[PDB]
Amino acid sequence: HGSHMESADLRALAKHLYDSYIKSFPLTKAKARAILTGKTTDKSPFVIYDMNSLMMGEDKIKFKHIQSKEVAIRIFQGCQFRSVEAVQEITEYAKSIPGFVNLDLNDQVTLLKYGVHEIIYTMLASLMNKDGVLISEGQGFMTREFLKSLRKPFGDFMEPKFEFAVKFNALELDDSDLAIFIAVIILSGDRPGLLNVKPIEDIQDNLLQALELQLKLNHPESSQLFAKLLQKMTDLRQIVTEHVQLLQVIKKTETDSLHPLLQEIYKDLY
Numbered sequence: 027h028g029s030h031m032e033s034a035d036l037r038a039l040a041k042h043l044y045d046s047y048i049k050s051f052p053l054t055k056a057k058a059r060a061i062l063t064g065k066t067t068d069k070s071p072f073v074i075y076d077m078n079s080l081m082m083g084e085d086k087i088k089f090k091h092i093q094s095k096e097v098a099i100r101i102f103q104g105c106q107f108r109s110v111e112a113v114q115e116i117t118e119y120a121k122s123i124p125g126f127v128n129l130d131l132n133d134q135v136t137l138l139k140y141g142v143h144e145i146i147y148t149m150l151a152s153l154m155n156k157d158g159v160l161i162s163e164g165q166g167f168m169t170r171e172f173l174k175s176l177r178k179p180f181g182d183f184m185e186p187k188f189e190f191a192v193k194f195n196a197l198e199l200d201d202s203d204l205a206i207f208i209a210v211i212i213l214s215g216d217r218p219g220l221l222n223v224k225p226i227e228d229i230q231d232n233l234l235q236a237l238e239l240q241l242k243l244n245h246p247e248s249s250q251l252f253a254k255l256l257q258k259m260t261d262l263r264q265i266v267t268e269h270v271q272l273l274q275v276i277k278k279t280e281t282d283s284l285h286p287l288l289q290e291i292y293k294d295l296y
């Protein structure tokens with residue numbers, strides 16, 4: 027429909043959330059895609075396609091701590107070290123969402139608990155194509171087929187992430203669309219264990235309308251793209267369930283997981 031004063035607010039909200047999306051996250055989908063196509067002035071990332079290429083990229087790494095079994099551990103421990111840094115960047119973006127910090131602190135924890143994994147899955151699509159995924163803030167690129175070649179419990183922990191990304195990146199969403207799409211996931215008013223739901227649903231419905239207005243403007247072709255995104259929010263919860271069910275098996279009937287003190291030692295040291 028036509029414009030008005032309310033449309034001026036949703037476009038300003040979309041820009042405000044976009045400004046926070048650029049600052050909260052260092053590698054946006056715009057630059058992440060520019061690295062994959064080689065059309066960026068930055069150096070080409072190191073490619074990990076076989077076991078031999080992996081034993082050359084680790085020589086560029088500073089540390090050296092964990093045999094064909096230590097590979098599946100170091101690789102898994104790697105994204106675990108980015109997942110902990112992910113929450114740092116996701117929380118800063120969540121705090122920048124207008125009205126999130128005014129919620130109850132117990133709800134802010136509950137929204138971030140069940141929602142951070144879906145954002146990790148969502149933003150992971152911005153870093154990967156049909157061949158591999160960008161790792162270490164665009165410094166490396168690990169092949170999808172190489173992640174399949176890992177040991178049996180670890181050859182299937184990245185594949186659900188690639189299958190969702192191929193269907194998700196087929197929508198050609200940009201940083202402006204993904205900015206509003208993440209906030210809607212954060213402000214999911216039906217997270218198990220919320221205190222005040224009404225103030226959260228007001229923000230989500232406000233973010234939903236700012237998202238639908240964004241998609242109608244930023245995507246003239248392909249109607250019902252807003253309905254396609256809402257189905258992806260339902261797909262993520264099914265994928266996170268299969269991921270958290272697989273993560274508890276590798277952390278209890280496989281690895282030791284990383285020690286709590288060692289993780290903070292590696293964070294502040296390098």
Ligand SMILES: Cc1c(C)n(Cc2ccc(C(C)(C)C(=O)O)cc2)c2ccc(C(=O)N[C@H](C)c3cccc(C4CC4)c3)cc12
Binds near residue numbers: 163
């Ligand atoms: C498997 C893997 C993925 C898939 N990546 C991409 C990735 C991007 C972005 C995200 C988030 C969630 C932040 C996102 O933006 O969506 C997640 C995963 C990686 C990024 C870096 C590394 C990694 O080993 N680094 C260094 C070398 C490192 C740092 C500390 C400790 C160690 C080893 C214990 C000694 C290694 C691994 C991976």
